[PDB]
């Protein structure tokens, strides 16, 4: 006797397991963006899919019907806040045409490398999970943050971080102590 804590899966494993084409596509996709599981890809494929379903289910209904209007506009403006859907494509028929990379391109991981705070994408990984990289007043340490558009123009280093400001890290002051003590001697 509680309420039963609801919960759900997030991804979905491919239907054909060994398919030299899908295999590769996936690998290059992990490569552009430095993902670690294929699972990271699947998660995207899956959200995408739920959106394509909502999309169609709206599409089959009459234009100027309250529901298609309401949920349509919502789905649209939601897709826009994260800048997955461009400003000009603001009509359902494009949200179908959406593909995976359009989602993979809004990760904090990605935007860190495309706002040039990192040297390579992998660098951006490390830098994120290292508690270095803030979005405004918040630190964020998940590579999958999914940057909204109005939060693009705030991403910087953490006021906590060595690069952001503050004091040097543990290694730095370790070597500072080593050289200072070795010279005092």
């Amino acid at each position: 006797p509680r309420a039963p804590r609801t919960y759900s899966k997030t991804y979905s494993t491919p239907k054909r397991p060994y398919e030299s084409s899908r295999l590769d596509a996936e690998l290059k996709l992990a490569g552009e963006f430095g993902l670690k599981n294929k699972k990271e890809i699947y998660r995207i494929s899956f959200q995408l899919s739920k959106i394509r379903r909502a999309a169609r289910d709206l599409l089959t209904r009459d234009e100027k019907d309250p529901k298609r209007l309401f949920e349509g506009n919502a789905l649209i403006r939601r897709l826009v806040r994260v800048g997955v859907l461009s400003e000009d494509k603001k009509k359902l028929d494009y949200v179908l045409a959406l593909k995976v990379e359009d989602f993979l391109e809004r990760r904090l991981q990605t935007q860190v490398y495309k706002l040039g705070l990192a040297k390579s994408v992998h660098h951006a990984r490390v830098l994120i999970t290292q508690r270095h990289i803030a979005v405004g007043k918040q630190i964020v340490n998940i590579p999958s943050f999914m940057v909204r558009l109005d939060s693009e123009k705030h991403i910087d280093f953490a006021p906590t971080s060595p690069f952001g400001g503050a004091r040097p890290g543990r290694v730095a002051r370790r070597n500072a102590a080593r050289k200072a003590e070795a010279s005092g001697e």
């Binding site: 006797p1 509680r2 309420a3 804590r5 309250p66 209007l69």
Partner: protein, 260 residues
Amino acid sequence: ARGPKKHLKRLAAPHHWLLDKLSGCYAPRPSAGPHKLRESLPLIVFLRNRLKYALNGREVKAILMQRHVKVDGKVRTDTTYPAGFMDVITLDATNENFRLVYDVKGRFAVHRITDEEASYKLGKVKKVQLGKKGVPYVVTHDGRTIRYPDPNIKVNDTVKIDLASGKITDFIKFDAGKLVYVTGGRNLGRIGTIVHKERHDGGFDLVHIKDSLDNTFVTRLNNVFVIGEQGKPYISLPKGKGIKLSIAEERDRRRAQQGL
């Protein structure tokens, strides 16, 4: 089971209390009283969930035990007292007066009330009848029995009641073209004028109602509750005035009250 149940599980509580579903496992089963379980609000809910005046349950008992909280002029000290529709609630230490009337969205709403409106109360007349020694009386929805009413008052009529003496000030008849709050059902929380009453014998009467935006709907007579006259209500309606808007209209109204 064997006797009456004394608990209420969390999920099984009437939804429009808006109890969150991880706070506990139980929910304040309303005591026996003036109103039906399903459609009443236990004071603890009104006090801790809707006024935020107390954080726990025992804080609420604490409050109630100083004879602070009145209901219909009188002091109740039962955490699970069932204050339902159109009841007056008095918090003297804040010098506030509340009325339990339905929000547009079918739930109970906080409503501040002047001292001059707190004095009285409306009551749907659920049944008139003749009691012992031939003395005629009415029974009004909040359970109140009133003796020697005016013979013009039959069923479904509303009655104004001085909370002080418990006597009948005046009343209102159930005729076409009156103002009306709809209490039970889906359209619960709406207000409008009664177009015409549909009469089905041995079954449920319906009522067509047309609101102030000249839109129409239908409910059983069971949920129709008379207020007053065209734009001349006897009680003060909340904001919203019992006018229900499509989700589009509400979306727009909300996004149009944002300019910082």
